[PDB]
Amino acid sequence: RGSFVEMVDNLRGKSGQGYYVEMTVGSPPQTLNILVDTGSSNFAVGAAPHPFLHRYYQRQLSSTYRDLRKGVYVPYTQGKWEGELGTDLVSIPHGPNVTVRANIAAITESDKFFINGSNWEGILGLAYAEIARPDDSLEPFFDSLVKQTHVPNLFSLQLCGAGFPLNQSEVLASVGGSMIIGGIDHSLYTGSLWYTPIRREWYYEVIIVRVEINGQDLKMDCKEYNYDKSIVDSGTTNLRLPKKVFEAAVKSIKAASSTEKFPDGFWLGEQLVCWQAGTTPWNIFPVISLYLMGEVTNQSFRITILPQQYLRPVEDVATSQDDCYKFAISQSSTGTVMGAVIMEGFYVVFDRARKRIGFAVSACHVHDEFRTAAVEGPFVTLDMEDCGYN
Numbered sequence: 001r002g003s004f005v006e007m008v009d010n011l012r013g014k015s016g017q018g019y020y021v022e023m024t025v026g027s028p029p030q031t032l033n034i035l036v037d038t039g040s041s042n043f044a045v046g047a048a049p050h051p052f053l054h055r056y057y058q059r060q061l062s063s064t065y066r067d068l069r070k071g072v073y074v075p076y077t078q079g080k081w082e083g084e085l086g087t088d089l090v091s092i093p094h095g096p097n098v099t100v101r102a103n104i105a106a107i108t109e110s111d112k113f114f115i116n117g118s119n120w121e122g123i124l125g126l127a128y129a130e131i132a133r134p135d136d137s138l139e140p141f142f143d144s145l146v147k148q149t150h151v152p153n154l155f156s157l158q159l160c161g162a163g164f165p166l167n168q169s170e171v172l173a174s175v176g177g178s179m180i181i182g183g184i185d186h187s188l189y190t191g192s193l194w195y196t197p198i199r200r201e202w203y204y205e206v207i208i209v210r211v212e213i214n215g216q217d218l219k220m221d222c223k224e225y226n227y228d229k230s231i232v233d234s235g236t237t238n239l240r241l242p243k244k245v246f247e248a249a250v251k252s253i254k255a256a257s258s259t260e261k262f263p264d265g266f267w268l269g270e271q272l273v274c275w276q277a278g279t280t281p282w283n284i285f286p287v288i289s290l291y292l293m294g295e296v297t298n299q300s301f302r303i304t305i306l307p308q309q310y311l312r313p314v315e316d317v318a319t320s321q322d323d324c325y326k327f328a329i330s331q332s333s334t335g336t337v338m339g340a341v342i343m344e345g346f347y348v349v350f351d352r353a354r355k356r357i358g359f360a361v362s363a364c365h366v367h368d369e370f371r372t373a374a375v376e377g378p379f380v381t382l383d384m385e386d387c388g389y390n
């Protein structure tokens with residue numbers, strides 16, 4: 001049974017632009033669409049006009065606005081946002097029937113943060129205080145929610161990729177998945193949930209202990225897979241891999257798919273590839289299995305993803321009925337990132353109460369008649385703590 005009907009189907013969006021949930025801030029409530037981001041820890045919202053914002057938080061119109069008189073500045077490689085800290089009353093309409101007082105970073109300045117046509121106006125950083133800006137004293141939203149209400153200390157995400165391009169109108173009309181706040185809805189997955197420990201509460205950090213490409217062991221020292229960390233991050237599009245792991249994986253994926261040659265720009269994640277309508281040769285691309293540390297000593301399990309996850313549907317550069325995709329695995333210098341395209345294969349349970357992440361096959365994962373995504377175990381795996389980087 002699915003016991004959280006109120007929250008089922010409360011997300012919209014897609015891997016390329018982000019998945020978002022409706023929220024309200026202030027009194028009277030101001031509605032905003034908010035990116036669900038398990039890879040950061042600030043609740044931050046557009047609070048001033050911007051060419052790509054249809055709306056923003058107007059603090060002067062909220063009677064419950066409190067000014068913390070403190071700035072916050074978040075630079076990343078792509079750009080930056082700067083804002084002003086305060087608190088206000090916050091609700092999630094398609095969420096628990098509660099209102100909480102939470103920290104809000106009112107974004108007043110930004111560079112390449114807001115995206116034309118994303119339909120979101122802010123970000124909900126769902127990770128832990130250690131990585132909150134400006135410092136760990138700024139309580140994240142979910143911590144406030146748990147402290148102030150009886151909502152259990154757990155949330156779960158089903159991100160639903162369509163398997164094909166969605167135009168502006170279609171993405172607004174389409175269900176993009178579910179964020180279940182405070183529980184696990186059994187309608188959103190098939191088979192069993194398998195849990196991996198949260199290694200440390202900052203990012204949602206996990207430990208990968210083995211990688212296979214079509215059953216073939218990538219055969220790297222498992223420390224390489226988690227160098228310098230491995231995280232689950234709904235606010236990143238791609239599966240990102242440490243440089244050396246990326247190089248090994250791409251070599252192996254190229255070898256498995258070698259009946260067709262793709263240009264270097266494709267493997268660099270820059271250039272799309274297209275096939276005649278309906279003829280995408282899924283079967284020539286390999287499955288990718290990531291083995292994760294289990295909860296039991298010396299036990300692991302695996303999650304298996306299809307090319308229908310790691311090839312991201314995109315519309316053609318020019319007018320055609322071709323089916324086109326970008327390669328959604330890319331290189332990282334900050335560790336492995338299990339981004340939205342991986343998360344689309346699975347129902348992911350962020351069990352903060354029990355310091356563990358659950359994976360099950362998603363009821364909305366894209367597949368074909370011959371292969372499905374999988375979550376399978378157990379496997380006997382020795383010395384898994386050695387796979388963690390220090």
Ligand SMILES: NC1=N[C@]23CC[C@H](NC(=O)c4cccc(Cl)c4)C[C@]2(COC3)CS1
Nearest residue numbers: 015016017018039040076234235236237340
């Ligand atoms: N986890 C992350 N959080 C941040 C906030 C979210 C931001 N992501 C996006 O704009 C975005 C765009 C398209 C698709 C998707 Cl899925 C996400 C990237 C960063 C920037 O700052 C924190 C870094 S990485």
